[PDB]
Design a binder for these strands. Sequence first.
RNA 1: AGUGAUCUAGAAAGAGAUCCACCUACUCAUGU
Lengths: 204, 638, 327
Amino acid sequence: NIHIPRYIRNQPWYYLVHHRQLDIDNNSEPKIGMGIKDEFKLSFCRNCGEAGHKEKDCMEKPRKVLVRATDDDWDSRKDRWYGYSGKEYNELISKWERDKRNIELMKLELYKDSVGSTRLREDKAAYLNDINSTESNYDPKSRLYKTETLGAVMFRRHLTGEGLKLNELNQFARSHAKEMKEKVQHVLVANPTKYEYLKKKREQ
Amino acid sequence: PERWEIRQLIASGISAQRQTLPVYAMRSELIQAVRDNQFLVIVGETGSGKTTQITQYLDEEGFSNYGMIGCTQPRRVAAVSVAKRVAEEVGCKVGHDVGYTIRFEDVTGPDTRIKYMTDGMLQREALLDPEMSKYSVIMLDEAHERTVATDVLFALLKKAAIKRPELKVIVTSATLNSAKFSEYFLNCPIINIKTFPVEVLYSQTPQMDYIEAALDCVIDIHINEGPGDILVFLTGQEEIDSCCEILYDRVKTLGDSIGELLILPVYSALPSEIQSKIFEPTPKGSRKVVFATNIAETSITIDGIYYVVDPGFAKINIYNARAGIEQLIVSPISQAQANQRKGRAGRTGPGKCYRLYTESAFYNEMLENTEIQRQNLSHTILMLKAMGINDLLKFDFMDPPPKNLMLNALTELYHLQSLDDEGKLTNLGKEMSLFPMDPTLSRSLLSSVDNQCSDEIVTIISMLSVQNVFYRPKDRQLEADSKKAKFHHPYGDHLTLLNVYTRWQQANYSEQYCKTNFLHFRHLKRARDVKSQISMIFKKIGLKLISCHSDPDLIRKTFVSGFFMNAAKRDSQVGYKTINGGTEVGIHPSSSLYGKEYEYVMYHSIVLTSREYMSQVTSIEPQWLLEVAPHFYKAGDA
Amino acid sequence: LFTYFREAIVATEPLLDILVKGETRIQNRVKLGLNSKMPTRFPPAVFYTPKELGGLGMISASHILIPASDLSWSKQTDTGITHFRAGMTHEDEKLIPTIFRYITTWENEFLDSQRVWAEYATKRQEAIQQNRRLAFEELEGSWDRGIPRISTLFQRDRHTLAYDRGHRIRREFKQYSLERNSPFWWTNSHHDGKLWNLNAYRTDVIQALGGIETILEHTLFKGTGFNSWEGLFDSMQFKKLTHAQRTGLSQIPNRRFTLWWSPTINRANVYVGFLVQLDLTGIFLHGKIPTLKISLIQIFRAHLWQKIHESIVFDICQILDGELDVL
RNA sequence: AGUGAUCUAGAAAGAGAUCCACCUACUCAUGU
Ligand SMILES: [Zn+2]
């Protein structure tokens, strides 16, 4: 599997495996929802008496703590809803609760027994019924889901019935080739009706 | 490339005992055959008494005229040792009434009635006398080993028989399968003669994996089977070393429940002392495991072997006649070889043989017998034309070689001037046939007087008629290479051969200064006796010994004046590149390659291993190619 | 500039002044292609991020402190560096690494070159004395040291470049016959090799922008669906269309550069900027930046925003149609 | 025993051949 060039396989001076520290590995599992793990880390002043700052940078009006921090990335940095105690959403919950406090052709068309009263929306492809974890029991390139019916484990389909009948037919063509222009007529799809009626005659 | 690095550097900064052998019990039958038939096949079992006994048999049943009996062996050691033994058996002096004959080792005199020689030496005798008139019976022994010299002698003697009624001929084999040999000698009779009865296991399924299956079989045998040594067969040194380290280590492990197990090698390069270790006893609570090449198929025994493996492979020469080229290929054995291997378990008791292939593959998929279909024929076509054979393509050969390899061989001999265009022996081709060498070596030697360096070129052709001289053990390659450098010649490993021979003849040493200069004493001795023999042929044939005062370019020109064909340019955008065939080779990793006058080599040996290599190389000026074989260096034919 | 004049730029004031001005010109060439040159809108992480991660991969030489001294005295004596003027200040504290620290200076190259070529000539003399061919598995560690490099000696065309002479002036007089000469007129990697190595620069740039996490928090990586970060890494200009339409051909990758850095271009820390809305979607731009607006029309066409919103809405309906009796 | 010296910043209409450095590279003789 040397598609790796010479310089990537060439290791650094100290000590393939040294790169694998996004992931270089599997990458076909789509990645998790990671997120809003948050942290808030932390003479004297003539105005307030507190230490640390001067009068030009005091925060009380001149009379005679937790920080949005621990940043490495950009999407963490902007974050319009970074701190969140659910204030605005509970306000809109309260607004919604205030707003929350406030013929015969159907009978004619039951002449047949229904007395009930852009895709299909009733397809339900068999990866959706494969909603529990399997080791990729579907591919989306060929769009072919495997079962025990017409499915195998590098593999093919079960040739069931008509496919098995053509397996019988080209093995009969191989038998008539390995037993008996005519140099070309030895195979099935070359002269098809010939070997078809020979296999029909063979069942008599 | 050397120049550019220097530029960047500047720019930067007792009698009764021999009765007991099986062949005695059919000696009557063996007259009646010998007497009634001009040619006869006899087939044994190795130990039955044929090499010793049958020639003696023949010398009472067929006696006095001015005549001898030859026996012929593919193996120098079998000729020597069996002639010593048969001299004792007669009660006669070795070199007298019984004698040898081997290349540059003759032990016969004007008394010798019974003459036990290499096949190669009977073939050289037959170059000097195409009737072999001096023999009244000729016995070609170990014919199953189907050497080049035995196959050419079989061909020849077919013809010689229909010129000489008073010549009788006895083809002796260790492979019960005579039908092929009877047919090839005009339906000739057969007479078919102490091996114990080997059990034979086979795998139920073709192995794809025979080294590790052989290792596990040997450890299994060592756990489960009773006392008796094991003989693996494996195909070369590198393999054998590897299986000796891993069965030594796995056997130490199973020593926590199992007897002690001593491994050894064996293969063609081994020093003598380690060869002798194969014969050691089989520890004491215990067994032993030889890990051999095919040398242990026939060429020795090791006395206590009861179990043979058999991954059915060996390291065989092969020659393509429509690429033009020999190679050295791990290859399935023949059925005859697989049988011999099996029969090494059996010398000392019942035995077992554990064949790492199917019974179907033995019966139906191994070739019967293995050399004429695996050879460059140049030597063979020189010998046939000395034998007067003017229609090579029609020569009556029990397996005819491809007519393309025969044609390529005439064309080489014409470019070596041994033959004229009309395929007729020049005065060179006559004299070259007098020497027991390949034609390229013989030609070099002959012309060396006319490069003013026939002593020097005598010494280098003697050296190149033996092994490598230089020991390089897999622990101490630095010390061995340091040694070797103190005879080396920069871009001239042929001149390195001259230097290490001269130092071996220095007034300063023998055996222990071979070992302390990592040299094979056995090689250097053999090269000294072949220098003595070849100087005797030089005197005999009037070729003047000559030297100069000190002249490497003269040495170079002589060597080129044989080995012209075997030249290899440096590529100027690529590797190294060859004049014949246009192969693309490398210089063998034994030898550095001083790329500054290097620009042509002349090479001794082409070595096929997984790559193409060229081995023992010496620089040549390419202008001296064009002056010393203008007909082979014609752009025109290129 | 910095692999030619390597250490000679420390003691040079007008070159550092023109470096700071020129890198500001290049950043404003990038930003005036977006019609907004705000410093908060454009971090240093959108320029020096390397070209694989989606950034421009600019090399910094102007986030240094320029040495400032008394300009009545500095034209008289060798003043010590008594003050530092700030080179290119961004609001972030991004210590962007500079190229001069990742280039070995020339004295520290040449003493090392004499050392490693003494070592090479000694090893070559020994390998001739050892009679062994000097294979280049021994010179490793000293393979990228020395001028010219040791890595030249075992390149695949050394026998061909053995006969190449006069290459310096051949590469220097290309400026009299080529319309766009390479600014490395002096070096030639066939004969000298790479005389510098800046693959350690981009690693420390990534480590200086905050690793991968701090880079990709600027990007639109998290909006994409990736199972891991590791799986992150024009045939129209060849068509004969129009001379004027090549402007839009150049316009096309500017859109993906702006869309990759779009969360940090369209970001909310804006000194002055009026919160307009996109056409037909709920994306609030912070200024009429054209290519960003075109890319956000490009993604959110066919009322896809609405076709997101409605869809999620009705899908919740299905869930609430699935869970009627429970609630 | 060291503090202190911090520009920019965007709206309309119009324009516009691009032409160039971020991955290394080579060892079997089966026999005689
Ligand atoms: Zn206050």
